[PDB]
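Re-running the complex after MR caught last week's input typo. The corrected sequence lines follow. Everything else is unchanged.
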Amino acid sequence: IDISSGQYQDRLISLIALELEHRRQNVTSLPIAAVVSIHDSVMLQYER
Amino acid sequence: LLDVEATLVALRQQHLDRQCYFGVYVAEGTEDTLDVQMGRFMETWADM
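Corrected-run output:
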């Protein structure tokens, strides 16, 4: 038993949330630089 | 045992000069994953 069936549902929900946030809001209070900064090292640290 | 306070307040009048200060007291954490924090700490220690 494992949880590998809701990946597509989570991806589509995240995409819908992002598109509605872009259409209505303008990020601002949502941290967008910290996530990019941490992912810049996560991409080369977690996959290797 | 408590007489060191007088010596400390007497010697506090005259100080010296030094460079390359350390990381003083505890700073404010980024409140993120440990991987990026430890990577930033190691890179700052390496290049500074």
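None of the earlier attempt is carried over here. Chain B touches chain A at residues 30, 32-33, 35-36, 39 (CB under 8 Å). The radius of gyration of chain B is 18 Å.
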